[PDB]
Design an enzyme around this catalytic site. Structure first.
Site, PDB file in Angstrom:
ATOM      1  N   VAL A  30       2.398   0.316   5.048  1.00 38.97           N
ATOM      2  CA  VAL A  30       1.978  -0.993   4.539  1.00 38.97           C
ATOM      3  C   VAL A  30       2.937  -2.002   5.159  1.00 38.97           C
ATOM      4  O   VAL A  30       4.147  -1.804   5.143  1.00 38.97           O
ATOM      5  CB  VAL A  30       2.068  -1.093   2.990  1.00 38.97           C
ATOM      6  CG1 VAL A  30       1.625  -2.485   2.528  1.00 38.97           C
ATOM      7  CG2 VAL A  30       1.182  -0.039   2.347  1.00 38.97           C
ATOM      8  N   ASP A 135      -4.387   5.218 -12.242  1.00 43.96           N
ATOM      9  CA  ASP A 135      -2.930   5.173 -12.082  1.00 43.96           C
ATOM     10  C   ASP A 135      -2.353   3.827 -12.491  1.00 43.96           C
ATOM     11  O   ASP A 135      -1.522   3.263 -11.787  1.00 43.96           O
ATOM     12  CB  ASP A 135      -2.566   5.434 -10.619  1.00 43.96           C
ATOM     13  CG  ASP A 135      -1.183   6.065 -10.453  1.00 43.96           C
ATOM     14  OD1 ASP A 135      -0.407   6.120 -11.432  1.00 43.96           O
ATOM     15  OD2 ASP A 135      -0.870   6.505  -9.330  1.00 43.96           O
TER      16      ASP A 135
HETATM   17  C1  LIG Z   1      -3.078  -3.279   2.127  1.00 44.60           C
HETATM   18  C2  LIG Z   1      -3.603  -2.886   0.815  1.00 44.60           C
HETATM   19  C3  LIG Z   1      -4.863  -2.230   0.803  1.00 44.60           C
HETATM   20  C4  LIG Z   1      -5.359  -1.892  -0.496  1.00 44.60           C
HETATM   21  C5  LIG Z   1      -4.590  -2.223  -1.708  1.00 44.60           C
HETATM   22  C6  LIG Z   1      -5.033  -1.966  -3.105  1.00 44.60           C
HETATM   23  O1  LIG Z   1      -4.446  -2.436  -4.093  1.00 44.60           O
HETATM   24  N1  LIG Z   1      -6.081  -1.095  -3.125  1.00 44.60           N
HETATM   25  C7  LIG Z   1      -6.874  -0.833  -4.207  1.00 44.60           C
HETATM   26  C8  LIG Z   1      -7.760   0.307  -4.126  1.00 44.60           C
HETATM   27  C9  LIG Z   1      -8.651   0.711  -5.208  1.00 44.60           C
HETATM   28  C10 LIG Z   1      -8.652  -0.061  -6.410  1.00 44.60           C
HETATM   29  C11 LIG Z   1      -7.772  -1.217  -6.508  1.00 44.60           C
HETATM   30  C12 LIG Z   1      -7.758  -2.099  -7.732  1.00 44.60           C
HETATM   31  F1  LIG Z   1      -6.675  -1.764  -8.384  1.00 44.60           F
HETATM   32  F2  LIG Z   1      -7.684  -3.369  -7.282  1.00 44.60           F
HETATM   33  F3  LIG Z   1      -8.777  -1.986  -8.572  1.00 44.60           F
HETATM   34  C13 LIG Z   1      -6.874  -1.612  -5.409  1.00 44.60           C
HETATM   35  C14 LIG Z   1      -3.332  -2.866  -1.669  1.00 44.60           C
HETATM   36  C15 LIG Z   1      -2.870  -3.183  -0.395  1.00 44.60           C
HETATM   37  C16 LIG Z   1      -1.605  -3.743  -0.310  1.00 44.60           C
HETATM   38  O2  LIG Z   1      -0.689  -3.013   0.054  1.00 44.60           O
HETATM   39  N2  LIG Z   1      -1.483  -5.027  -0.628  1.00 44.60           N
HETATM   40  C17 LIG Z   1      -0.287  -5.666  -0.845  1.00 44.60           C
HETATM   41  C18 LIG Z   1       1.004  -5.068  -0.638  1.00 44.60           C
HETATM   42  N3  LIG Z   1       2.111  -5.778  -0.846  1.00 44.60           N
HETATM   43  C19 LIG Z   1       2.065  -7.098  -1.268  1.00 44.60           C
HETATM   44  N4  LIG Z   1       3.241  -7.820  -1.502  1.00 44.60           N
HETATM   45  C20 LIG Z   1       4.523  -7.346  -1.588  1.00 44.60           C
HETATM   46  C21 LIG Z   1       4.743  -5.986  -2.061  1.00 44.60           C
HETATM   47  C22 LIG Z   1       6.036  -5.466  -2.158  1.00 44.60           C
HETATM   48  C23 LIG Z   1       7.098  -6.355  -1.767  1.00 44.60           C
HETATM   49  N5  LIG Z   1       8.362  -5.969  -1.841  1.00 44.60           N
HETATM   50  C24 LIG Z   1       9.431  -6.901  -2.263  1.00 44.60           C
HETATM   51  C25 LIG Z   1      10.572  -6.805  -1.275  1.00 44.60           C
HETATM   52  N6  LIG Z   1      10.990  -5.412  -1.128  1.00 44.60           N
HETATM   53  C26 LIG Z   1      11.943  -5.536  -0.030  1.00 44.60           C
HETATM   54  C27 LIG Z   1       9.962  -4.445  -0.709  1.00 44.60           C
HETATM   55  C28 LIG Z   1       8.697  -4.595  -1.512  1.00 44.60           C
HETATM   56  C29 LIG Z   1       6.929  -7.718  -1.290  1.00 44.60           C
HETATM   57  C30 LIG Z   1       5.607  -8.222  -1.201  1.00 44.60           C
HETATM   58  N7  LIG Z   1       0.878  -7.728  -1.483  1.00 44.60           N
HETATM   59  C31 LIG Z   1      -0.285  -7.040  -1.281  1.00 44.60           C
END
Ligand SMILES: Cc1ccc(C(=O)Nc2cccc(C(F)(F)F)c2)cc1C(=O)Nc1cnc(Nc2ccc(N3CCN(C)CC3)cc2)nc1
EC number: 2.7.10.2
Length: 255
Positions: A30, A135
């Site tokens: 990711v 989950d």
């Molecule tokens: C690419 C992707 C693709 C899919 C998903 C996702 O839900 N999928 C999903 C699948 C089935 C059902 C559902 C539901 F729940 F919606 F019903 C969702 C999520 C992502 C996906 O990964 N999206 C994502 C990741 N990070 C962020 N932001 C983000 C996350 C962590 C951190 N940090 C803070 C600083 N640290 C250094 C490390 C981590 C900083 C920004 N924002 C969005």
């Protein structure tokens, strides 16, 4: 009339620029990146051979039918290896990590109740669509820069899993409700692991006896009793997410 080898939600890989790895591992990674330069996005890339492209892409198709402001929004996909899934980017990361930042630590019980309702709101949508999260936990909740929450699922253990699910593999929106009860402890303890100092087998034995998690520290008794409803023995006795959202909103408007 798009080509058959492309998805309706396709975008050229060239419109994306991956800048920062947010997480890696098993079936891929990711990354935080940019779309056409000005728009921040999140990108899940499939690790070739780790799993089937169709299997990978099934997730996006699922997200196509689950669009809501309280859920991570699907943006697009790239269906030629490496396969990508692109979604909106939530600035403050996962709720579990955010609650431990200098900001999160300082959040009042009023703000926590707010966010809890917000999540309950997203689960209500999920509930109305006849979907099952499977989950639901603070690790799968994203926080925006305006401190709003969104349900997600990063495809990643007993402590959040309800008895019938553990014992029969039967997951429903009712087992999600149980998991929500637990998520509620994570919120009020600013990210602490549920059942402090207990192993899985211990938790299991306790639940079978009819014991439930000990009141977390500094937890409003009213909040604890709502959690109790989420942990009822019979799945059919646990409330609906609309009810949960309804009560949380009241606790929130009373603080
Ligand atoms: C690419 C992707 C693709 C899919 C998903 C996702 O839900 N999928 C999903 C699948 C089935 C059902 C559902 C539901 F729940 F919606 F019903 C969702 C999520 C992502 C996906 O990964 N999206 C994502 C990741 N990070 C962020 N932001 C983000 C996350 C962590 C951190 N940090 C803070 C600083 N640290 C250094 C490390 C981590 C900083 C920004 N924002 C969005």
């Amino acid at each position: 009339q798009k080509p058959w080898w492309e998805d309706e939600w396709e975008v050229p890989r060239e419109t994306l620029k991956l800048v920062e790895r947010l997480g890696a591992g098993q079936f891929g990674e990711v990354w935080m990146g940019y779309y056409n330069g000005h728009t921040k996005v999140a990108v899940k890339s499939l690790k070739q051979g780790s799993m089937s492209p169709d299997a990978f892409l099934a997730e996006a198709n699922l997200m196509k039918q689950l669009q809501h402001q309280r859920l991570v929004r699907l943006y697009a996909v790239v269906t030629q290896e490496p396969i990508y899934i692109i979604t909106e980017y939530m600035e403050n990361g996962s709720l579990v990590d955010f609650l431990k930042t200098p900001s999160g630590i300082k959040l009042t019980i009023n703000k926590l109740l707010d966010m809890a309702a917000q999540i309950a709101e997203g689960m209500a949508f999920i509930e109305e669509r006849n979907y099952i999260h499977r989950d639901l936990r603070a690790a799968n909740i994203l926080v925006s820069d305006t401190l709003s929450c969104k349900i997600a699922d990063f495809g990643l253990p007993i402590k959040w899993t309800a008895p019938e699910a553990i014992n029969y593999g039967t997951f429903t929106i009712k087992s999600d409700v149980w998991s929500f009860g637990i998520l509620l402890t994570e919120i009020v303890t600013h990210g602490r692991i549920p059942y402090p100092g207990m192993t899985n087998p211990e938790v299991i034995q306790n639940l079978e006896r009819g014991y439930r998690m000990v009141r977390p520290d500094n937890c409003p008794e009213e909040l604890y009793q709502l959690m109790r409803l989420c942990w009822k023995e019979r799945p059919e006795d646990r409330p609906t997410f609309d009810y949960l959202r309804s009560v949380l909103e009241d606790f929130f408007t009373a603080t």
